[PDB]
Nucleic acid binder design. Structure first.
Ligand code: NA
Ligand code: NA
Length: 327
DNA sequence: CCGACGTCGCATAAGC
DNA sequence: GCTGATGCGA
DNA sequence: GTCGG
């Protein structure tokens, strides 16, 4: 399917989704509209009516109604109205700043703070995260070409090995599935000395080395197991600077690493199907472990996992490359 | 009819 | 001061 | 908002 097939409907639903999350603060309506937009974006026909669309799982009576009015008039009275509402459109916009959620955006607009300009004049009202999000507003909304991701991966793997050659690092997400672009970099980290039944400095030393070679530029959050921050590729001589990128790094126990790598490689539709096929076979898979059920649903101890393939073996599936993990 | 809708690490607030 | 709740992102 | 027990 292509854009001009049902793009008007999906953009409409996505827009409605954002106002639910950011303004009405109804996260489940937000996910409902998104789910509806997703199943429509994949539907290989130009939708003629709300009734036709209601067949798809995720599209109910109200969205069917809203599709009918769009097809007949080319717009939605409610969407048009909230679009021009100065208060609501500002709350919705401010949430595009990383660190500014629905609650913060509401507070800012409550006291006349509506724009990036307003945010820039009111730095003392921003926490550390929001300042970084403000500083890199444009960059954070840019996607990352795979070639740059490869160059980013090169640096991460190199410095990680340089700190301790026994570290194991894996860049997951859509990148590992071979996507041509990425929204951010998701790095999963482990070490043989770190298990579940067992230094608290393993993550810090890696972050430290990446900051020191000036790859990591900023820190959003950082604990003993999870790092969230900003990075940037070195500028190729005289040429234009690279955009600042979002990078996450997590330290996972060795015995939970490949369950983690599997989960955060995705896709989410693939994960869903996989942990659906697994209950069938008497196993429960989460992001950490795989456990056996249990003649009455009582989960047993986590099974030993030493690779992604090990998980597939447990539930009698053949190993499927990250490339072929869209569903 | 009515509850589910993912879950959790980290920063920060909020109350004690 | 310490702790649980909340906000946020993923 | 949608699904389903
Ligand atoms: Na439906
Ligand atoms: Na935000």
């Amino acid at each position: 399917p292509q854009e001009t097939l049902n793009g008007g409907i999906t953009d409409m639903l996505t827009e409605l989704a954002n106002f639910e999350k950011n303004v009405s603060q109804a996260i489940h309506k937000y996910n409902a509209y998104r789910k509806a937009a997703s199943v429509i974006a994949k539907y290989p026909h130009k939708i003629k009516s709300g009734a036709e669309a209601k067949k798809l799982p995720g599209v109910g009576t109200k969205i069917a109604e809203k599709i009918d009015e769009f097809l007949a008039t080319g717009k939605l009275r409610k969407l048009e109205k909230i679009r021009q509402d100065d208060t609501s459109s500002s709350i919705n916009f401010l949430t595009r700043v990383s660190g500014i959620g629905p609650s913060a955006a509401r507070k800012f607009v409550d006291e006349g703070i509506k724009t990036l300009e307003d945010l820039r004049k009111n730095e003392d009202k921003l926490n550390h995260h929001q300042r970084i999000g403000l500083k890199y507003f444009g960059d954070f909304e840019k996607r990352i070409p795979r070639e740059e991701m490869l160059q980013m991966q090169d640096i991460v793997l190199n410095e990680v090995k340089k700190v301790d050659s026994e570290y194991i690092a894996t860049v997951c997400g859509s990148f590992r599935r071979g996507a041509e672009s990425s929204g951010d970099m998701d790095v999963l980290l482990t070490h043989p000395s770190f298990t579940s039944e067992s230094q608290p400095k393993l993550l810090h030393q890696v972050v430290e080395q990446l900051q020191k070679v000036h790859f990591i530029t900023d820190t959003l959050s950082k604990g003993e197991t999870k790092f969230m921050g900003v990075c940037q590729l070195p500028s190729k001589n005289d040429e234009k600077e690279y955009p600042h990128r979002r990078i996450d790094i997590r330290l996972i126990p060795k015995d939970q690493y490949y369950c983690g790598v599997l989960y955060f490689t995705g896709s989410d539709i693939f994960n869903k199907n996989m942990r659906a096929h697994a209950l069938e076979k008497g196993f429960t898979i989460n992001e950490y472990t795989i456990r056996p059920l249990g003649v009455t649903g009582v989960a047993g101890e986590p099974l030993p996992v030493d690779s992604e393939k090990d998980i597939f073996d447990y539930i009698q599936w053949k190993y499927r490359e990250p490339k072929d993990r869209s569903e």
